[model samples]
Every structure is written in structure tokens, then in C-alpha cells.
Target chain A: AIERTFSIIKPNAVAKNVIGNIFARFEAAGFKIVGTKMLHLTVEQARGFYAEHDGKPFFDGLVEFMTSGPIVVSVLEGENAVQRHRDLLGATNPANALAGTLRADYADSLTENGTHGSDSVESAAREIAYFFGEGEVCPRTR
Target chain B: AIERTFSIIKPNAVAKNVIGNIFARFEAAGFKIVGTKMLHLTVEQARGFYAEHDGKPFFDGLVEFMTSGPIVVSVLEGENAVQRHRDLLGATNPANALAGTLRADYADSLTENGTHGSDSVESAAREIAYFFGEGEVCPRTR
Candidate 1:
């Protein structure tokens, strides 16, 4: 089945002015950008999105980086979109990423990961609604 | 300095699923989409946005059509952005629009005009904020 997943262009990528370029890559991969918007997240809002990591050290710097600037959150539609987005984004640590992946090309560190990809189909539905709600997203999926 | 202006993909065009195609047209014309989102407007919200046109019969049907479905609002940047956007969109009434213009291509009647372009630079700032607030827009201008 054609599926939908959420993905994010992180602050580091935005600051680098790679928004349009990154979107072009997703389009190249046959993923349709069905819904999208750019905004800066507040600390509290970021906490809610990362709630599952409340007690972890990753929560702290991750919030710091994500809230530093504006980011683009978008819903992509394609077959196996969740894993496909993950595969296209490469590893969390850019150092270990493949040469052609998004992180490998743009990320400076683990927290500076250029993009965020939903790990599962279930989580995609959850995260997609965090920023976009009813009538907030105009979509045409294949 | 590069100017920023507001625009809308009205309900008729959105109902036809021309959101992505319309955006592509602006990008091709050298306008950068600095901010954007899709949403359905309520009667009260629509009245507030079209406040300037109050007391006229032109106001009623506009609100009805606008609130009828989801629409995409965006901020576009370019030199003389307000007028440039107007030029690209063509006339307000599709009936008299120039050939190849957005409205000429997709619109049906005056009320079903496909896209709304900012009429002035001052109004652009005012309208752009009605939907996107602080930390809600991102920019990268030449």
C-alpha cells in the first residue's frame, strides 16, 4: 500500500539554506511532498515531540539544536515511506553515514543530523499530527 | 532590498489538487516560498481576513467559497514581490485574465479565481501574519 510518513529538515540544514535543495532530493526519490510548513519550535513544544526521551541526555542537546532555528516539517507519500525516508536520511551520526545520504552530505554531528525520519508507520501518524491538524494539511497522495 | 508578499491558493484550485503545480510556477518565476501552510477557514476567520471588503456584496460569496475547503497560504519573496505576484497570477476575474496565467488556466468564475496575489507591499505584511506568527516563517533572500 502507498503510505505516508513525516520527515523534518533540522535547524542545521535550514541555517545552511538547503531547504529547496533537500526537497528536490525527496522529489527525485519519487516521494511526493503532500504537506509541509516551516516554523521554529519552542522548548516546551520540542519536549512534547521528544517526550519518550525525557530522562535521556539525548533529550537536552537535541532540543537545543532543534529549537535554535526554523525547520521544515513535511509529510511524504510513497510505498514504504517510513523506512524509505529512514534509508534516504542515513544514520543519526553523520560520521557513519553513506556518501550519498542526506546526513552524510550535510550533517556536522549527531545532534546536527540534517533530517529526522519516522522509524515506524505508527509513529509517522503520531508525529505527523504534532504540527499539522485537520484542514491544516492539503494532500493528494498517489 | 528583496520584498516579501502574501498569496493564496483558493479553494477551487485546491479542490482540483493543483497546490504543487501552482508552487512550481512561482519558483520558476524566481520567487522563493519563504513560508506556507494549508488550512480550512471558518466563517469568523474569513470575515476577519476580508475585513477591508466589508459592507459590500462582494464579501459574502468570497467567505463562503474560501471556508468551503482547505486553502494554501504562502509568502513569496522577490523584487517588488507584491506586484510581481499580481503579474504572475493575472486578473482577479478569470474571465478577463491573460492567456497562460494561473487563473486563466484553472479558474471558472470570478468567485472561483484560482490564486490571490497581494495588491500592495503594506497589505502583504498585514495579511502574511494573519496565518503565520512569530517563529512561524522562514526566509532566505537574495
Candidate 2:
């Protein structure tokens, strides 16, 4: 039961130059990054992308923050990728966050969590569509 | 700057068959697992090892649980191994823990959290001594 998940190496990690260590964690976990892109989201695209959170007070803030720098979008592959990716990110609040969770350890604040992963199968499918074309993300012919 | 950190992969990952994935995470992260060991601890050894926590209410519980399993203790080397290891472990409570942090991703309970690391530079030195011998855990030299 191989699975695919969508994840983004958020802008803070890029700005801090911890990309190598960050990727090392994934590689060591036995997950494969099948597809990847460096995207700098424009203000409009950022707002549109986060439209799901339209009524949330933090929506505009998220848009502005995400588009402030380059983000790395990647497709990861493995068994149970949905849960697996979730396990790796840790809690959303970096302050109370566990030491090892992606946000707790690497991110400066909730507004600056270092990475993002799809929350469910539906979201994975939808997010993948937003970030990649069919057949563009890594295929699991194996 | 070169830094040192302590780590111990618990018995379950080995017993349950996931060390390869565990190692993959470190290897991918570019951390050199400079020294490693697979071992079991006796009750006396466990008590002595965690002696600093002797008076704590949870001390006995910690000792009992640790001695109940096998663990792979390691010395990790990197630019910031102490901080890096913490990030990888995620929040202590798995529910609030992020997806990518090691504990969030692998551990089922707080007691059974999959790994441990030294909390600071001073603690790193103490841990290195307590867990390894002079010739055994020291870094490889040419």
C-alpha cells in the first residue's frame, strides 16, 4: 500500500539555509521525494491558494507570510504517507511544540512553521492537483 | 560549528523492525552516526544512569520503562546536533506533536517515545560519558 503526500518546505527553512538538514531527515526516514519545485508565490496566488481559510482571522496573514519568500513544494512517497507525513511535522505551535516536531524544532512561530503536509487523503489529492499536473509528480511504477 | 548530541533509538523500533528507516532519517539528514550500540540495561544500571532525576515523582516510572526495552544509543555529529536532534523528536506529547518530529511520527506513548537526546552542551558531555567509553563513543579519527 504505497501512498503519496504533498508537503511544502516552508519559507523560513529556505531563508535559514537548513534545507540540507531538513531533507536529510526525510531521506533518513525512508520516504522518497518523487517531485519537487521551488515556487515563489505571488500575493494574488497566495490569497487564492489559502482561500479555504477565508473567514479565519489569520487567513490574510498566512497569505502575506507565505508569499514573503520561496517555498519548496514536494511530493513524498511511502507506505501510509498520509499519517507518516503528519507524524513528522509535530504540533502547530512551535513554542509548546515538542523538540523534534518540524515546527517545534525548526520553525520560529506558528506563523513561520518550517513545513506543511496534507492532512488527509482528500487534501492530498486536492493539494497535489494545485501543485502538480497529473503524471508530473513522481510515479510509483515500482 | 561542529556540535555533538546524544541519541538512543528504543528497543521497539529494533524489535518491531524499523531501524533501517530510523537510520535512513539520520543518514539523509547528513548527520554522521559517529558511534552506536545495541544494548539492554539492568535495573541498577538504569537507576544509576538516570540518577539526576532520582527525587522526581516520575523517576521510578522512567527507570522501569527504560529498562523494559532495548535501545540504540548514538553520538550524532553535525552543525547543530543538539538542536537538530530535538527538532527531529517532535513535541513530547504525540497528540500535539507535529508530523515530522520523530516522536510524533513513531512513538505511540510518551513513555515509549522512540528516541532521546542531550538537552544542552553541558548535558551532552555528561551523557556522552555516561553512555559510552573513552574508546567506544569517541569520534573516528584518521
Candidate 3:
């Protein structure tokens, strides 16, 4: 079985130059690389990306933190990608994350969590579309 | 500014071994790899993933085709990830997709569209969480 999902190396991780380390975990887990890129987010982009968090108490801070630096954004393809990626990323709040989880291991705090993943199939489609256009994707040959 | 999104290389593309081609396109677009897997979706999973189309006439065929074989599921992250991915993927039907988009380049029909992308940020977060867990991710380190 094969599938597709999404993830992000947040500002916290990008600042530390550990994008490669994080990518290894996904590779080790047997995920096939699909799509990827690096970019700095604009205020408008961040606002739209985190629109759901709008009106939340930490919305401003969240936006500020994301736009503080460049981040890595990518697409993955494999089995149960939606759920499997989540298990790898850990809890939203690092404090509540398991000891070996991504958040517990590198996240500075909930606001500075090291990574992001899609939560469901429907969500996967929408999120993937957000960053990648149909023409941008390379057809998987292997 | 950063965000994560999702995508799926449909059955048609997988059957044709174009997964790598599609991934390369995303990479070229600057999307960073995050979460991914390969799985043959169950009928239930397909139904849930496309729940919105439940009443549509094409719903049954959509599920049947998805479960017919293994498809690549993936997650991508970047600035304005949700929308960027869409532009890369192009329209749902190859007939209507732009000349260089994934759909236009690889898709053979409407139902067998080459790929799928998320529609919005809210859906992106939800979709990412669906496949990837908070713990499965490895922390990025310097």
C-alpha cells in the first residue's frame, strides 16, 4: 500500500541546521522522498497558513516565530503517511511528548516545536496542494 | 513563514511507476520532504478520505480505483504550502490541467488524475496529523 502526506521542519529546527538529521528518520522509516523545498515565509503567507489559529491567544507569537527564519517544507509518499508521520513528530506540546519523540528530543517548547505533519487523508490533499503545484511534482519513476 | 501540506500519487501514476517523476517535480519547486509511505488503501479508508464526494456519482469508482492498488501518500512543508502545491499539481482533470502541470503531464483521465493536493491551511494541519504522529518524528539537530 502506498499513500502521500506532508510535513515541515519548523524555524527551530532550521535554525539549528538539523534538517538532514530529521530527514534521515523519515528515510529510515521507509518513506520515499516525493517533493521538497526551502523558503522564508512572509507575514501574509504565515497568516494564511495558520489561519485556523487566528484569534487564538498565541496566534501573533506563532506567526512571528514562523516568519523569524527560513523553514523546510516537503511532501512524502508511502503507507499510512498521514498517521505514521504524526507518530514520528510527537505531541504538539513538547512537555507532553514521549521521551524519544521529535518534540521531546529537539523542540524548545510547544511554540517552538521542531516539526509539523498532516493529520488525515483529506487534510493531506489540501496541505499538499498548499505548497506544490501539479507541474512542480516530478513523476515518481522508482 | 512555514506550513505543511499533503498529497497522494493516485493509482494511475503508481501503476505507471511515475512516482519518482512526480517527486522530482516537487523537489524542483523547492518543497522539502517530510512524511511519506506506500499502502494499498482499504475501502473504508478511501471512503473516509473522499467522504465529501460520498453522494457524487463518481464516488464508487473513485474508491474502487484507489483500493485497486498501492498509492504513494506524502506530506510536504513550506511557506504557503497548501496553495503552492496546488499550482504545481494543476487541475483535477488532465483535460483541464495546464500543459506542464502534473495532472496534464501524467493523468490519463479525470478519475485517474495523476495527483491530489490539499485545499486550505486548516485542512493541511488536520491532514498532516492524520498520517503522522507527534512521536514518530525525529528531532532535528545540528
Best by lDDT: 1
Question: Retained native contacts per candidate, as fractions?
Answer: 0.23, 0.48, 0.00
Error of 3 at B104 (Å): 39
Q: What is candidate 3's lDDT per residue for A21-121, written digit by digit as tens? A: 67666766767556665566789999988898899998999999988877777787788888888998889899999987788887988889989999998
- Residue B5 displacement in candidate 3 (angstroms): 29
Q: What is the TM-score of chain A alone in each candidate?
A: 0.94, 0.92, 0.94
lDDT of each residue in B44-139, candidate 1, tens digit only:
999999998888997998888888877778888888788889899998888899998988987878888889888988889899888888756776
Q: Which ten residues in a row have the lowest lDDT in candidate 3 chain A?
A: A133-142
State each model's CA lDDT, in order: 0.82, 0.78, 0.77
Candidate 2, position A78, lDDT:
85
The candidates, ranked best first by DockQ, are: 2, 1, 3
Candidates 2 and 3: which is better by DockQ? 2
> Candidate 1, residues A1-142: lDDT per residue as tens digits?
7889998988877666566667767876878677878777889999999889999978998788788877889888889888998999998899999998999988998878889989999999999989888766555521
Which candidate do you rate higher for TM-score, 2 or 3?
A: 2
- Which parts of model 1 are misplaced by more than 4 Å? A1-4, A9-35, A41-69, A76-117, A133-142
